[PDB]
């Protein structure tokens, strides 16, 4: 262990398709670690194991046969490459709504870990979804990745009694820092079209129906310190999504600055009588969002258009404040669920294990107290609107946002509480709960019966 | 044979199976002389106008498509042997000409084309009998689809065209009554009383009306309505047919001394194959939509050039060069990606 | 199970607040005290209630003005229509969060009868059998000429872009896609018209200007205008069929003659070079100018205050 013995020459099997440059950028620092020649097996034996996971991040090699051999001090590592094509034309379970996913993938194009994934989907709430993606690492770093994606999908919005047709391209730059966080700066230019209005469509939906283009630059930050994302019993999660559209160089039909944050956590509790992992934990959550209208140009002072139903926030549902219909919070024009400009949702749950069943089982019992608010911006504060409507000055918008935020504090937030069972399936979390709305505004939809929710994000 | 009229082949005991083609034949028979014109059985793919009926003025080598354009052209350029409230009669003829082409045509589509039971028993066999062997598998599907689009606004479907039947027949009767009521006022028989219309309008009226009455069909709802409720219009059609077209128009100057022999002029082995393959090309997904548009524009310039105009030359050379560039880059990519040594080696060693 | 649960389920919720206010954009457009007819127009035109530039929307807008109904117009798109196409009417909100069902184009006359501001029989009376034939000269012969000249004719490309695709979006990419779809749709209709279409090329409808005969469409419109002028000359009144007041036939014709003079009346310099008389000039030259006076008289009744209708 403490004996100095440099590895020196090493050899890797099963690299017949990846370029030597990719391996050189990964294994060369490992060789330089042996230059110390002090407690090598305590310093270089961990280094190769640390760098072994670097190869698995490229996804080119099969992680199953990631064996490592030892000898004397030559080190031989044997890996196997994945199939160059994988027409995974299958259905979806965790994402039940995900229906089918004919995901075709061209892996390891050009030797580096490039990948052309031409996915295609069709199911409930989504008539069609054709996505062509081309991802490639930058400078050989597996953490830093660049992706170019072109999509054409027709999503359905039953709550708002319409459907949206999306057609555009994205340019993403994902990055994973050494701490574990995941930054993502993406530029998107999509063409949104509201069509297929239901016979019960509200006048608000009709007024917003048409064609618009959104050229936005959005940055996403995620810090997931939870032990298990599906069943968070310890740790915390912080996610922040900030988007700037239509302002400055970005040209489009919408101009705003949308920011959304989310903070979660869970605190385990140990029964004094019980020993080891009790399995009981107390969690929490908090989501905030602000939609600030902005003018079109390079100036921060000017007339700003009001937000549209495409960009306004939607609250309520199984992945949102529970006890309410999907999009059951916020302003409601008749029966349609129009969006809001600011929102604030919170949650306080407590996971419990079922009796006569070990804590290691994914089955748990949850008692939640979800609550949330969702208000829409208006120009009631201003003294008088000009002759040409739908144009609010900087003072009017700023006053409108202050009034909208002030509306969150006064009055009890829309609150619902209930109990249910949660399944921590690794692909996606399945939840079935019996809810009961307690406080809500008139026109909001609350469900008092059994509610079934499936997905990866929950409040 | 100063002019040649390209029309559909005879069917249902009539000189042609198309309402507009039958109207064009009737107009030539009454006005033009026996030896001045010739009737050629053809299909839309045979003529550059892609439309039937089509007139070919051999004097000026001009292609004219459509019944209204054919009659207008003849008036402006009368052949040597041509014999065609005064303004009210001219105005009425224009109004009924547009009415027949807009409301009588969808009604005829329902009886013959939209009705699947009627189409598969009488209309479909008739089309195949006037076409060379490989064509009835491509052209009648196109004719029926175009004719079905004409009757789309009628609101009725194949199931309606025949308790489900207690009101299905009501819609058919209501649709037929609306069209037939307007035509009954005209009094096309040219007798005493009633409105007066030009000869061209009378020929056009017979062409549409004859195809609703004469054809024997398994579902003759239109024939029963026409005979039961409009005896005056039924009498006009029979009298017009018995005079203009005795024994089913066998004395008409068909090319090569026969209706079927006329089509053989432009139905050679190479010509038929070329017409058939072009129809198949237009059905190739994502390329037919682009081949047909290119072919339609190419034929449009041919018709315009015949008329005496000078259409601007197209950019076909640029697309041909552009297509060649696409092959080279595709070929280079295949030559590069395929046949190249592997990027990595099975054994990689660092000192 | 249902009965024991029902007696407890009505206890919840405990506190119910007032409904949330609608967004600013919804509160500025959907709020009003008069029924709103959504037509193809501009923001400036809708303020003064000027005639729409869409012949389909102008026909119904003119009829509502002849029915003494008090209403306003707002620019909109075909996507918002309850029937997939404009025009349509939205009655004023009874409550800030509730609105009645929209009135389609077919039901416009019925709605105007229930809200007098009466005897609207002439506006929807059935036409005589002879008059039905002349109606086809407007809905088919004149409609195809308008569609061919506005969409397929490259001369009116600037007008088509400004009227339809420019207000839709500021994106040069989306505008191009919309222009393609608009022209493709117009071509399909002008093709289902024995006047200038009727060509069979495949199992799909013709959706290009190359599969449409422009000369036949133009000639049919010229014949239709002369025929309609003769029909009006028969009337002893200033309207069709000797009626004391304009009816549905006059509104149907005015929806095309007014727009032809307003927009398609180009300059004689371009017409002389092209060798073809514009649509607007044929309206004024149809017959002995009967159609020109009819359009002015129709404007002087439905829009008495307007005075900028020359072209
Ligand atoms: C334990 C060590 C490793 C340190 C670094 C970790 C601290 C985090 C993960 C712990 C410390 C205190 C925890 C904490 C305290 C109290 C509550 C209130 C409860 O309603 C929601 C969970 C929440 C917010 C949890 C979340 C997880 C926290 C923030
Ligand atoms: C959504 C719009 C406003 C776009 C422009 C967002 C910009 C901000 C939020 C982004 C752009 C570049 C990002 C950025 C660049 C580089 C680093 C270095 C890293 O070690 C810490 C994070 C940090 C500092 C991040 C933080 C978030 C930044 C500053
Ligand atoms: C119900 C909500 C409000 C619950 C989930 C709250 C979450 C927030 C407030 C929690 C989650 C993670 C927590 C957190 C993580 C880590 C540390 C480092 C420690 O040295 C100081 C406290 C600090 C900075 C705490 C502060 C409180 C945080 C940010
Ligand atoms: C690491 C040692 C030296 C000391 C400083 C740390 C103490 C921890 C246990 C303390 C410090 C800050 C505390 C803390 C900060 C803020 C909040 C937000 C609140 O909504 C839930 C409790 C929570 C999350 C608490 C939980 C307990 C924390 C995380
Ligand atoms: C979002 C999660 C944390 C859930 C639990 C929300 C809790 C808050 C919003 C709830 C819990 C208890 C509630 C509460 C308790 C009692 C009263 C007394 C009443 O006369 C005024 C309202 C008031 C003051 C309400 C206000 C809203 C409170 C404070
Ligand atoms: C017109 C004068 C009198 C005063 C009131 C207006 C100042 C403007 C220029 C200021 C006031 C509030 C500012 C403002 C508030 C909040 C945000 C959200 C942030 O994520 C992006 C910047 C943004 C959008 C800024 C932009 C500049 C604003 C709009
Ligand atoms: C439809 C696709 C599959 C195309 C490529 C296939 C075409 C073949 C199979 C068809 C096209 C034309 C057809 C054809 C034309 C005419 C005749 C004359 C007849 O007396 C014998 C059969 C014969 C010779 C048939 C045979 C089958 C042919 C050759
Ligand atoms: C030998 C003659 C007398 C007859 C009976 C034979 C016909 C068969 C062998 C051939 C002749 C023409 C062929 C034919 C013509 C055109 C098409 C259109 C194409 O999109 C599908 C195949 C289809 C439908 C093929 C199928 C096979 C056919 C029908
Ligand atoms: C030697 C030829 C000239 C003799 C047999 C003539 C045949 C006639 C009947 C014509 C009529 C339709 C023609 C025909 C139709 C369609 C095709 C499909 C094409 O992909 C190959 C040629 C082929 C199959 C040709 C061959 C020649 C055919 C069958
Ligand atoms: C946070 C956990 C630990 C537990 C205690 C919370 C329970 C919630 C669901 C309970 C506790 C107090 C309750 C509460 C207090 C007071 C009122 C005022 C009444 O006019 C409406 C209901 C309302 C607002 C109710 C709603 C349900 C509340 C908020
Ligand atoms: C995530 C949010 C929605 C969670 C934490 C719930 C409530 C938050 C917003 C807090 C912030 C200010 C609080 C608040 C301020 C003032 C009052 C007036 C009092 O007479 C009733 C309670 C009430 C209305 C409370 C309820 C709880 C509020 C509204
Ligand atoms: C150059 C070749 C390789 C290109 C054009 C591709 C295919 C060729 C072989 C052509 C020949 C016959 C064509 C063919 C025949 C009949 C039909 C039926 C129609 O309802 C769908 C298209 C379809 C199925 C087309 C597809 C394209 C085919 C199969």
UniProtKB/TrEMBL annotation, chain A:
<dbReference type="GO" id="GO:0045040">
    <property type="term" value="P:protein insertion into mitochondrial outer membrane"/>
</dbReference>
<comment type="similarity">
    <text>Belongs to the SAM50/omp85 family.</text>
</comment>
<dbReference type="GO" id="GO:0005741">
    <property type="term" value="C:mitochondrial outer membrane"/>
</dbReference>
<dbReference type="InterPro" id="IPR039910">
    <property type="entry name" value="D15-like"/>
</dbReference>
<keyword id="KW-1134">Transmembrane beta strand</keyword>
<dbReference type="Pfam" id="PF01103">
    <property type="entry name" value="Omp85"/>
</dbReference>
<dbReference type="InterPro" id="IPR000184">
    <property type="entry name" value="Bac_surfAg_D15"/>
</dbReference>
<feature type="domain" description="Bacterial surface antigen (D15)">
    <location>
        <begin position="108"/>
        <end position="458"/>
    </location>
</feature>
<protein>
    <recommendedName>
        <fullName>Bacterial surface antigen (D15) domain-containing protein</fullName>
    </recommendedName>
</protein>
<keyword id="KW-0472">Membrane</keyword>
<keyword id="KW-0812">Transmembrane</keyword>
TrEMBL record, chain B:
<dbReference type="Pfam" id="PF10568">
    <property type="entry name" value="Tom37"/>
</dbReference>
<keyword id="KW-0812">Transmembrane</keyword>
<dbReference type="GO" id="GO:0007005">
    <property type="term" value="P:mitochondrion organization"/>
</dbReference>
<keyword id="KW-1000">Mitochondrion outer membrane</keyword>
<dbReference type="GO" id="GO:0001401">
    <property type="term" value="C:SAM complex"/>
</dbReference>
<keyword id="KW-0496">Mitochondrion</keyword>
<keyword id="KW-1133">Transmembrane helix</keyword>
<dbReference type="GO" id="GO:0015031">
    <property type="term" value="P:protein transport"/>
</dbReference>
<feature type="domain" description="Mitochondrial outer membrane transport complex Sam37/metaxin N-terminal">
    <location>
        <begin position="21"/>
        <end position="144"/>
    </location>
</feature>
<feature type="transmembrane region" description="Helical">
    <location>
        <begin position="317"/>
        <end position="337"/>
    </location>
</feature>
<dbReference type="InterPro" id="IPR019564">
    <property type="entry name" value="Sam37/metaxin_N"/>
</dbReference>
<keyword id="KW-0472">Membrane</keyword>
<protein>
    <recommendedName>
        <fullName>Mitochondrial outer membrane transport complex Sam37/metaxin N-terminal domain-containing protein</fullName>
    </recommendedName>
</protein>
<keyword id="KW-0653">Protein transport</keyword>
<dbReference type="InterPro" id="IPR050931">
    <property type="entry name" value="Mito_Protein_Transport_Metaxin"/>
</dbReference>
UniProtKB/TrEMBL annotation, chain C:
<dbReference type="GO" id="GO:0001401">
    <property type="term" value="C:SAM complex"/>
</dbReference>
<feature type="domain" description="Thioredoxin-like fold">
    <location>
        <begin position="55"/>
        <end position="155"/>
    </location>
</feature>
<dbReference type="Pfam" id="PF17171">
    <property type="entry name" value="GST_C_6"/>
</dbReference>
<dbReference type="Pfam" id="PF17172">
    <property type="entry name" value="GST_N_4"/>
</dbReference>
<feature type="domain" description="Metaxin glutathione S-transferase">
    <location>
        <begin position="221"/>
        <end position="298"/>
    </location>
</feature>
<protein>
    <recommendedName>
        <fullName>Thioredoxin-like fold domain-containing protein</fullName>
    </recommendedName>
</protein>
<dbReference type="InterPro" id="IPR050931">
    <property type="entry name" value="Mito_Protein_Transport_Metaxin"/>
</dbReference>
<dbReference type="GO" id="GO:0007005">
    <property type="term" value="P:mitochondrion organization"/>
</dbReference>
<dbReference type="InterPro" id="IPR012336">
    <property type="entry name" value="Thioredoxin-like_fold"/>
</dbReference>
<dbReference type="InterPro" id="IPR033468">
    <property type="entry name" value="Metaxin_GST"/>
</dbReference>
């Amino acid at each position: 262990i403490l004996t100095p013995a440099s590895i020196s020459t090493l050899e890797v099997h099963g690299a017949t398709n990846t370029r030597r440059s990719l391996l050189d950028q990964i294994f060369k620092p490992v060789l330089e670690d042996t230059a110390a020649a002090g407690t090598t097996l305590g310093q270089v034996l961990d280094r190769v194991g640390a760098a072994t996971k670097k190869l698995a991040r490229f996804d080119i090699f099969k992680e199953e046969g990631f064996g490592v051999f030892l000898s004397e001090l030559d080190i031989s590592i044997r890996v196997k490459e994945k199939s160059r094509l994988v027409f995974s034309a299958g259905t979806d379970f965790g994402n039940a709504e995900g229906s089918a996913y004919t995901n075709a993938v061209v892996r390891n194009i050009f030797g580096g870990a490039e990948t052309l994934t031409v996915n295609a989907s069709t199911g409930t709430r989504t008539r069609s979804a054709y996505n062509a993606t081309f991802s490639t690492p930058i400078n050989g770093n597996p953490d830093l990745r660049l992706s170019v994606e072109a999509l054409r999908s027709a999503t359905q919005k039953p709550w708002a009694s319409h459907e949206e047709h999306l057609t555009g391209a994205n340019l993403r730059l994902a990055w994973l820092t050494e701490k574990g966080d995941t930054h993502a700066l993406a530029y998107s230019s999509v063409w949104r079209q509201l069509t297929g209005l239901a016979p019960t469509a509200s006048p608000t939906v009709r007024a917003d129906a048409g064609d618009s283009l959104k050229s936005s630059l959005t940055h996403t930050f995620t810090r997931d310190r939870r032990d298990n994302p599906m069943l968070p019993q310890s740790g915390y999660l912080f996610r922040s999504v900030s988007e700037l559209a239509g302002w400055g160089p970005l040209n489009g039909d919408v101009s705003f600055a949308k920011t959304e944050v989310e903070a979660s956590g869970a605190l385990p509790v140990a029964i004094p009588g019980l020993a080891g992992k009790s399995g009981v934990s107390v969690g929490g959550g908090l989501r905030l969002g602000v939609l600030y209208p902005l003018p079109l140009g390079y100036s921060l002072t000017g007339a700003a258009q009001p937000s549209r139903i495409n960009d306004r926030f939607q609250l309520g549902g199984p992945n949102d404040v529970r006890g309410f219909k999907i999009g059951g919070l916020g302003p409601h024009d008749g029966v349609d669920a129009v969006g809001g400009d600011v929102f604030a949702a919170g949650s306080v749950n407590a996971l419990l294990p079922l009796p006569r069943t070990g804590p290691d089982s994914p089955l748990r019992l949850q008692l939640y107290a979800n609550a949330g608010r969702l208000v829409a911006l208006n120009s009631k504060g201003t003294d008088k609107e000009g002759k040409e409507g739908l144009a609010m000055d900087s003072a009017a918008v700023f006053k409108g946002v202050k009034s909208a935020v002030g509306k969150l504090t006064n009055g009890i937030p829309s609150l619902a509480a209930g109990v249910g069972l949660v399944y921590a399936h690794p692909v996606a979390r399945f939840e079935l709960n019996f809810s009961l709305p307690l406080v809500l505004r008139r026109g909001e939809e609350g469900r008092k019966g059994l509610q079934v929710g499936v997905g990866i994000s929950f409040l | 044979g100063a002019v040649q009229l390209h029309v559909w082949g005879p069917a249902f005991g009539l000189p042609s199976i198309d309402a507009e083609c039958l109207a064009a034949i009737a107009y030539l028979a009454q006005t033009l002389g026996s030896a001045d014109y010739q009737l050629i059985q053809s299909s839309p793919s045979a003529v550059p106008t892609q439309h039937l009926p089509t007139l070919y003025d051999s004097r000026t080598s001009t292609w004219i498509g459509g019944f209204t354009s054919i009659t207008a052209h003849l008036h402006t350029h009368p052949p040597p042997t041509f014999q065609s409230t005064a303004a009210s009669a001219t105005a009425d003829g224009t109004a009924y000409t547009a009415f027949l082409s807009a409301h009588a045509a969808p009604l005829l589509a329902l009886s013959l084309y939209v009705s699947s039971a009627n189409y598969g028993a009488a209309t479909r066999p008739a089309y195949s009998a006037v076409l060379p062997l490989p064509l009835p598998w491509t052209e009648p599907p196109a004719v029926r689809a175009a004719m079905a689009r004409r009757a789309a606004h009628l609101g009725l479907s194949s199931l309606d065209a025949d308790t489900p039947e207690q009101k299905s027949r009501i819609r058919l009767e209501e649709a037929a009554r609306e069209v037939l009521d307007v035509l009954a006022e005209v009094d096309w028989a040219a007798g005493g009383g009633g409105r007066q219309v030009a000869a061209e309008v009378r020929c056009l009226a017979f062409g549409y009306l004859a195809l609703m009455l004469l054809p024997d069909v398994p579902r003759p709802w239109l024939r029963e309505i026409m005979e039961g409720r409009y005896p005056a219009l039924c009498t006009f059609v029979r009298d017009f047919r018995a005079r203009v077209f005795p024994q089913g128009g066998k004395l008409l100057p068909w090319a090569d001394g026969g209706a079927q022999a006329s089509a053989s002029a432009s139905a050679s082995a190479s010509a038929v194959a070329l017409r058939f393959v072009r129809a198949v090309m237009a059905e190739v997904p994502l390329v037919g939509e682009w081949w047909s548009r290119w072919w339609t524009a190419r034929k449009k310039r041919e018709v315009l050039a015949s008329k005496g105009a000078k259409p601007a030359p197209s950019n076909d050379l640029l697309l041909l060069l552009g297509a060649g560039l696409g092959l080279t880059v595709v070929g280079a990519g295949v030559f590069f990606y395929r046949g190249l040594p592997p990027f990595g080696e099975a054994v990689q060693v660092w000192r | 199970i249902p009965r024991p649960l029902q007696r407890l389920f009505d206890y919840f919720p405990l506190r119910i607040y007032e409904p949330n206010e609608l967004p600013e954009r919804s509160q500025q457009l959907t709020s009003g005290d008069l029924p709103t007819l959504y037509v193809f127009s501009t923001d400036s035109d809708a303020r003064l209630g000027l005639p729409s530039f869409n012949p389909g929307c102008l026909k119904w807008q003119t009829l509502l003005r002849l029915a003494n109904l008090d209403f306003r117009i707002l620019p909109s798109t075909n996507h918002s229509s309850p029937t997939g196409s404009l025009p349509f009417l939205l009655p004023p909100r009874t409550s800030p969060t509730a609105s009645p069902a929209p009135i389609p184009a077919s039901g416009l006359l019925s709605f105007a009868r229930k809200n007098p501001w009466l005897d609207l029989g002439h506006l929807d009376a059935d036409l005589p059998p002879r008059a039905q034939a002349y109606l086809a000269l407007i809905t088919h012969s004149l409609r195809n000429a308008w569609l061919c000249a506005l969409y397929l004719d490259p001369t009116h490309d600037a007008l088509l872009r400004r009227l339809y695709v420019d207000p839709a979006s500021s994106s040069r990419a989306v505008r191009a896609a919309l222009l393609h779809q608009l022209r493709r749709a117009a071509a399909e209709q002008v093709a289902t018209a024995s006047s200038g279409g009727g060509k069979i090329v495949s199992l799909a409808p013709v959706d290009s200007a190359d599969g449409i005969d422009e000369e036949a469409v133009y000639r049919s419109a010229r014949d239709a205008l002369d025929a309609l002028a003769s029909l009006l000359r028969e009337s002893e009144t200033a309207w069709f069929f000797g009626t004391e007041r304009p009816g549905s036939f006059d509104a149907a014709l005015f929806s095309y003659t007014h727009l032809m003079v307003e927009y398609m009346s180009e300059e004689e310099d371009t017409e002389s070079a092209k060798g073809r008389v514009s649509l607007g000039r044929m309206v004024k030259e149809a017959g002995n100018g009967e159609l020109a006076e009819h359009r002015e008289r129709m404007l002087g009744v439905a829009w008495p205050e307007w005075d900028g209708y020359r072209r």
